Amino acid sequence: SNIIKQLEQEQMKQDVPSFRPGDTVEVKVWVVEGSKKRLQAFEGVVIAIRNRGLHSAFTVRKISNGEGVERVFQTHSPVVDSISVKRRGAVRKAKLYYLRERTGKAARIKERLN
Amino acid sequence: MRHRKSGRQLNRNSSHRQAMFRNMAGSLVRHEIIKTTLPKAKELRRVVEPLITLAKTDSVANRRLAFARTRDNEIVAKLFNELGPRFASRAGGYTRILKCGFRAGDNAPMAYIELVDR
Amino acid sequence: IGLVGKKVGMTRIFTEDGVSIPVTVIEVEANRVTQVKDLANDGYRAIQVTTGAKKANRVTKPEAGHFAKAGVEAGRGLWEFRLAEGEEFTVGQSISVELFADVKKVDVTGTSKGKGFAGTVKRWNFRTQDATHGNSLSHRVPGSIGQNQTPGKVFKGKKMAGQMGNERVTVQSLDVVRVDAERNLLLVKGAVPGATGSDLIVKPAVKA
Amino acid sequence: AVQQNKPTRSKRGMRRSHDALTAVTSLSVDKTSGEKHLRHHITADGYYRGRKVIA
Amino acid sequence: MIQEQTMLNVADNSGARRVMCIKVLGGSHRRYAGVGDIIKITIKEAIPRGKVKKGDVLKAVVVRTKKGVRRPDGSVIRFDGNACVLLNNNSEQPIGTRIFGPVTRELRSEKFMKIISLAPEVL
RNA sequence: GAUGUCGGCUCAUCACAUCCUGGGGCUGAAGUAGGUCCCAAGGGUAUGGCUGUUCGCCAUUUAAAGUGGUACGCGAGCUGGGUUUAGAACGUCGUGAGACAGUUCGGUCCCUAUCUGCCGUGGGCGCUGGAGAACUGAGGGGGGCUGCUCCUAGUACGAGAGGACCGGAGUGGACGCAUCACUGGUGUUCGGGUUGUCAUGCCAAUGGCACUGCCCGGUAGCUAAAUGCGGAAGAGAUAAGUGCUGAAAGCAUCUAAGCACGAAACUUGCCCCGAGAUGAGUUCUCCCUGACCCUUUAAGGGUCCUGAAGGAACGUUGAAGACGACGACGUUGAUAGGCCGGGUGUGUAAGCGCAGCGAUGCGUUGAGCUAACCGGUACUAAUGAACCGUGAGGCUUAACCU
RNA sequence: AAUUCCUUGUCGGGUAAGUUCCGACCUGCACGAAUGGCGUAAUGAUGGCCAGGCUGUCUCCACCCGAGACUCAGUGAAAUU
RNA sequence: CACAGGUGGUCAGGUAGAGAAUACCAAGGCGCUUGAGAGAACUCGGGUGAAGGAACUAGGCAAAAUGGUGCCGUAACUUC
RNA sequence: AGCGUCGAGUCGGCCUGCGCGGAAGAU
RNA sequence: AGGACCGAACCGACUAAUGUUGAAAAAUUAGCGGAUGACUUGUGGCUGGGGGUGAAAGGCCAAUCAAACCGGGAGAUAGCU
Numbered sequence A: 001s002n003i004i005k006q007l008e009q010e011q012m013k014q015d016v017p018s019f020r021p022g023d024t025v026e027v028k029v030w031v032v033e034g035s036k037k038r039l040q041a042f043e044g045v046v047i048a049i050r051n052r053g054l055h056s057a058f059t060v061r062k063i064s065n066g067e068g069v070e071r072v073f074q075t076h077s078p079v080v081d082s083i084s085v086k087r088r089g090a091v092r093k094a095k096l097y098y099l100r101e102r103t104g105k106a107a108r109i110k111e112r113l114n
Numbered sequence B: 001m002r003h004r005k006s007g008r009q010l011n012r013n014s015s016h017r018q019a020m021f022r023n024m025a026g027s028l029v030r031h032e033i034i035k036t037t038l039p040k041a042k043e044l045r046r047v048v049e050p051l052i053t054l055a056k057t058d059s060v061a062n063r064r065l066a067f068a069r070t071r072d073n074e075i076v077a078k079l080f081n082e083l084g085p086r087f088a089s090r091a092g093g094y095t096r097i098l099k100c101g102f103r104a105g106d107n108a109p110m111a112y113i114e115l116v117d118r
Numbered sequence C: 001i002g003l004v005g006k007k008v009g010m011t012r013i014f015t016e017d018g019v020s021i022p023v024t025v026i027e028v029e030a031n032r033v034t035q036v037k038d039l040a041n042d043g044y045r046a047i048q049v050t051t052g053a054k055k056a057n058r059v060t061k062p063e064a065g066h067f068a069k070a071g072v073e074a075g076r077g078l079w080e081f082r083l084a085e086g087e088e089f090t091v092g093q094s095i096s097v098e099l100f101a102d103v104k105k106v107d108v109t110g111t112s113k114g115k116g117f118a119g120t121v122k123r124w125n126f127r128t129q130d131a132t133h134g135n136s137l138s139h140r141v142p143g144s145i146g147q148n149q150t151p152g153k154v155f156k157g158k159k160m161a162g163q164m165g166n167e168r169v170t171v172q173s174l175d176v177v178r179v180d181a182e183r184n185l186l187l188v189k190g191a192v193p194g195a196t197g198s199d200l201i202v203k204p205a206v207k208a
Numbered sequence D: 001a002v003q004q005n006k007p008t009r010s011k012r013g014m015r016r017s018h019d020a021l022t023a024v025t026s027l028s029v030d031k032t033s034g035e036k037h038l039r040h041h042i043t044a045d046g047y048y049r050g051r052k053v054i055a
Numbered sequence E: 001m002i003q004e005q006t007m008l009n010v011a012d013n014s015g016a017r018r019v020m021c022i023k024v025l026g027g028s029h030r031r032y033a034g035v036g037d038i039i040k041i042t043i044k045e046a047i048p049r050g051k052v053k054k055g056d057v058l059k060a061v062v063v064r065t066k067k068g069v070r071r072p073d074g075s076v077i078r079f080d081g082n083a084c085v086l087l088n089n090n091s092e093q094p095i096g097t098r099i100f101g102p103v104t105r106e107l108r109s110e111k112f113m114k115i116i117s118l119a120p121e122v123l
Numbered sequence F: 001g002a003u004g005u006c007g008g009c010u011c012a013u014c015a016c017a018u019c020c021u022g023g024g025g026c027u028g029a030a031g032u033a034g035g036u037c038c039c040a041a042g043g044g045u046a047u048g049g050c051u052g053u054u055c056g057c058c059a060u061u062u063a064a065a066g067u068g069g070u071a072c073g074c075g076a077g078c079u080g081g082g083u084u085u086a087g088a089a090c091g092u093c094g095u096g097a098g099a100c101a102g103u104u105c106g107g108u109c110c111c112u113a114u115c116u117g118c119c120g121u122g123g124g125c126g127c128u129g130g131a132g133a134a135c136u137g138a139g140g141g142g143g144g145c146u147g148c149u150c151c152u153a154g155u156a157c158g159a160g161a162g163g164a165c166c167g168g169a170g171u172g173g174a175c176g177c178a179u180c181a182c183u184g185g186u187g188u189u190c191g192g193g194u195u196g197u198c199a200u201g202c203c204a205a206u207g208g209c210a211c212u213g214c215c216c217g218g219u220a221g222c223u224a225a226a227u228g229c230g231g232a233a234g235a236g237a238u239a240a241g242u243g244c245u246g247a248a249a250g251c252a253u254c255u256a257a258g259c260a261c262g263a264a265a266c267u268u269g270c271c272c273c274g275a276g277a278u279g280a281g282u283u284c285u286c287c288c289u290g291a292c293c294c295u296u297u298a299a300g301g302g303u304c305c306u307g308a309a310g311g312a313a314c315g316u317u318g319a320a321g322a323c324g325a326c327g328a329c330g331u332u333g334a335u336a337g338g339c340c341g342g343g344u345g346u347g348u349a350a351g352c353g354c355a356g357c358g359a360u361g362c363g364u365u366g367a368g369c370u371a372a373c374c375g376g377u378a379c380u381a382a383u384g385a386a387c388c389g390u391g392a393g394g395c396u397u398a399a400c401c402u
Numbered sequence G: 001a002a003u004u005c006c007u008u009g010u011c012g013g014g015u016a017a018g019u020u021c022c023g024a025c026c027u028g029c030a031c032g033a034a035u036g037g038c039g040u041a042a043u044g045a046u047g048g049c050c051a052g053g054c055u056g057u058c059u060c061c062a063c064c065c066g067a068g069a070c071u072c073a074g075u076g077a078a079a080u081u
Numbered sequence H: 001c002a003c004a005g006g007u008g009g010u011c012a013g014g015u016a017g018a019g020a021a022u023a024c025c026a027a028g029g030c031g032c033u034u035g036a037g038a039g040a041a042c043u044c045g046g047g048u049g050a051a052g053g054a055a056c057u058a059g060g061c062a063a064a065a066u067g068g069u070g071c072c073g074u075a076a077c078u079u080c
Numbered sequence I: 001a002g003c004g005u006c007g008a009g010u011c012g013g014c015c016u017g018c019g020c021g022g023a024a025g026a027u
Numbered sequence J: 001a002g003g004a005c006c007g008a009a010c011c012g013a014c015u016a017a018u019g020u021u022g023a024a025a026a027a028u029u030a031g032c033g034g035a036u037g038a039c040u041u042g043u044g045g046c047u048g049g050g051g052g053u054g055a056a057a058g059g060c061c062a063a064u065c066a067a068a069c070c071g072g073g074a075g076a077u078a079g080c081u
């Protein structure tokens, strides 16, 4: 409890930017293709955030090369090098699962300009 | 299993329980002491004491939340004008349950539940 | 030997190379030796240890005198560990989680969570019968429990409904992720038996 | 499913070996009124732990 | 998480459009194929003049699943559809010359390095 | 004066004439891979298409898809497609009623478990003074499956083609145990959106009802599809088998004496139960060190005093639980509820102001509300007692001390 | 074939695989012309077969809400023997 | 049987609705003559469900699904 | 019999007593 | 216009589950068919047991039907238990 808090807090990233559901975010992930390591960008809409301390996660949805892809990132994972908000989205809901049933013009999110 | 679960079903559905405790909370605020079954008395604490807590801060919003949860403006008025003021310095424990034996008709364990400064 | 600890809960350790190791956090406070069993007196070699801190009112006079003989404070219980051919310990010696400093794998024993009275589907992984296709009142029921006149009885050990969990379980060969002697913590990879708060007996892995 | 043989009065008695009621071990005595009561319950005159709690 | 009767999209230009898993290979009572697993397929729908025909029985490697893949940090990658790449029944080598849509790094193996090379991205 | 029937489903259990995996002899056994026989029952031992099918054929798996017994195991466990009532029709037979072990369509499957058994779980008494703990381990149960890849090694073997033993490493399938950190499901106790309607005087705001009205999310818990772990190694004694030395029988001979190997079987090793193990075990600790009189002088009986350790009861309760039980706590107190702070979830409350003709938008505002969560906190309820349990614990013999 | 024993006839179609189904063939065990033959739009809680959708039917079950089951108080059966 | 059954006629409010359907209400009438707890298995009646989607089964049995109005549009075949 | 050597028995039919293998089953 | 269509009342009873010492000696629940007609329903009437009535199932004729029920022949007879 207080013990696990302490174990968790010392592993937590200190530099996680503010983002909300509906934001376009670019997540740069470490990819080890051999022993060489490089950053691979994954850009898309944040459809879900789990706020849970060290166990925090967020789900990013992109359309890649025809196909809808979702990636659930573990926020404090060392695999996630950096997160950056590319665009602020204006949505009502915490969870944008309704975007799974939308493509193109129907899947557009209004910008939150404030 | 019911590991870590709260709330008694009391051989009712959710809508009946909610309605019953709204009535019973109204009864306790109005009369300041009621006789009921010991399990109902224990559950009633979890309904009535938050209403008294809400009633410590008099505002339109809080009166409306109290009205939403009681549906009786006599009760809301008593909460905000009397009980909240009466309990302003007390940190919880606005009620006490006193066990008072067994009901004739069904041997139900009975208790009085009262406001502590009745 | 091993040590007695407490299941604090589960978390994860992120490794630098981006692995999340699921860990059970075990609080291993000082185990104080209350009795040393020997071959002459007791017929086997063991230590009895205590851990934690029981309140005086809950310590009976029999319990108090046992602790008082050892010259240790009352802990929340007593556990024995059998001694190896070499191992020697003294009464009143405190044994810390530093014991596990060089141990790679542990066996963790606890009391499993109690499921109460469990059906055969849950308890024994029995298959359900048809939900439809005419099934009459026999969806999760166990089916046949024997043959016929031969043998004309149900065999002992027949898998049937009954109490499930709330029993001693050992999980073997769990990797020791971290021994934190300063915080009295052992981190083991993966799940161990029992609820948060329950007593755990941790021993070096028997198998290897 | 039903018996093939009438169970005996003996067997009936044996089954009822666990049916005996337990008397109240002891009644508590109110410190003020002196009334006997179930422990942790109010007295018939409405005392509890010396205090007149009901009327 | 593909089983017998699961319909899959085809992530190649072999000519198949829709294929059905008729067997999860590689063990007795094996329930499911995830990404990187070889399945037996039948072609349910194909293009007119492709390398494969409707009703042909082949192997395929599952390259995308809705259930998705887990990574060592606890992350998940999920796709909107189940897709596979058709393989020669004997050689287990890709029939098509192109790969369509993302694949995962689970395919990174001498067996499927052709798929990796042809794929438009690897996640 | 009824022993329910084919097939399926559920759940099995045994045999071994062994399907796989293990050991081995012979081979017309180069290797690989077979053939055949011996040992071996530990564990394992397909999903589908068709058909009522069992079976079978077929498709595609698998290390393998064993063969049998068990009322052709299993309907007071399920099904009811088949068989086998009454309806109807076809072919066929019959003048006909009707009939067919020909076909066709339709066609009620009851039982609240007394006993045995079995799975769980208590109460009683016992175990010799009582009590609280920790144990020993007689005995019992669980578990025991296996693929593929790589290395050894393109080595041995082979004309090539191909391609090992032995040994080692990795990674899977199936199965099992645990767990909820993760990924998710659920989440009628949390938040929100919204339709119809009724109400709270009305507006505004709310509540009821409509499957939780319909929905969208979701906390804790429970949980699998989630993720940890397991099968072993080792040891003993062996099976078939292989031998050493070795006579009887100057030789030979694995055997008669003697000695050595030898398998998933056996006994252990691993896990769980376990002293009602009445053969009732051990260890540690704790508690009680009063008077008195009878008679049936005896493990006799009763009184007066005493009431221990500890237990139980009651109460607050629990990731313990059908009830019992088990665990925590009872003011010298965090046991539960409340309360405070936090987290989490939902997603910017109400009110007010502003913009708009208005729906509505914007600001105040990531607001308000927030269960089972976390950290705290005696506000409420856990009572002073009372109750049970006693007062040094039999005889005999030995060994020691007096 | 509501008729075909042999029979899952044979050939074609559909399926990865089809004793059923559809189309044929004719070798009609044992069709056949008002105890009607062969067709036939429409109709059918009619029989058979296929497909899309759909799903806890199933892989393989999980959780939840209620009514019982369980405990307490009151009342109080039954078959059978 | 104070029994979820059966029993002809008459009357016909509001909001929504095509409606005497249906939902919510009015007038009016009722909460069904054992209750109290608990929150096991299992049964019953329901809700939701990852991935798959008939692999279930004698058989898609059951369930899930479809579902309104206006307009557009609509095949073989046909006794038109 | 083993290798002329070697110094005591050896060889295998018959009849018969008792044993041995042949000999795998399901709670 | 219609033994027309969709659909309540009304009439019915195709499927499933429940129930099977039932709430009920045939129902309940969810679905289902007909619903201006060869429809349905109230009241009364007529048909009588080898008889009736039957859009025909040996259906129905008072929870009884290959010959109702009640009383009688009657203590039928019973080489059977």
Ligand SMILES: C=C[C@]1(C)C[C@@H](OC(=O)CS[C@H]2C[C@H]3CC[C@@H](C2)N3C)[C@]2(C)[C@H](C)CC[C@]3(CCC(=O)[C@H]32)[C@@H](C)[C@@H]1O
Pocket (backbone or CB within 6 Å): F002, F003, F004, F005, F084
């Ligand atoms: C009625 C007897 C049944 C239930 C069934 C019986 O099967 C027959 O007798 C076949 S004849 C068939 C029986 C039932 C009753 C009338 C009709 C004809 N059908 C529906 C059957 C299968 C046997 C052949 C004869 C013995 C049985 C006991 C054991 C068994 O297997 C039974 C009898 C004693 C049993 O009571």
Ligand SMILES: [K+]
Pocket (backbone or CB within 6 Å): none
């Ligand atoms: K068998």
Ligand SMILES: [K+]
Pocket (backbone or CB within 6 Å): none
């Ligand atoms: K061999």
Ligand SMILES: [K+]
Pocket (backbone or CB within 6 Å): F041, F042
């Ligand atoms: K075996």
Ligand SMILES: [K+]
Pocket (backbone or CB within 6 Å): F071
């Ligand atoms: K039989």
Ligand SMILES: [K+]
Pocket (backbone or CB within 6 Å): F075
């Ligand atoms: K059967």
Ligand SMILES: [K+]
Pocket (backbone or CB within 6 Å): F076
């Ligand atoms: K029986």
Ligand SMILES: [K+]
Pocket (backbone or CB within 6 Å): none
């Ligand atoms: K039954």
Ligand SMILES: [K+]
Pocket (backbone or CB within 6 Å): F115, F116
């Ligand atoms: K018996």
Ligand SMILES: [K+]
Pocket (backbone or CB within 6 Å): F180
């Ligand atoms: K979880």
Ligand SMILES: [K+]
Pocket (backbone or CB within 6 Å): none
């Ligand atoms: K959850």
Ligand SMILES: [K+]
Pocket (backbone or CB within 6 Å): none
């Ligand atoms: K409303």
Ligand SMILES: [K+]
Pocket (backbone or CB within 6 Å): F275, F280
């Ligand atoms: K004992």
Ligand SMILES: [K+]
Pocket (backbone or CB within 6 Å): F121, F325
């Ligand atoms: K128990």
Ligand SMILES: [K+]
Pocket (backbone or CB within 6 Å): none
């Ligand atoms: K508290």
Ligand SMILES: [K+]
Pocket (backbone or CB within 6 Å): F348, F365
């Ligand atoms: K606002």
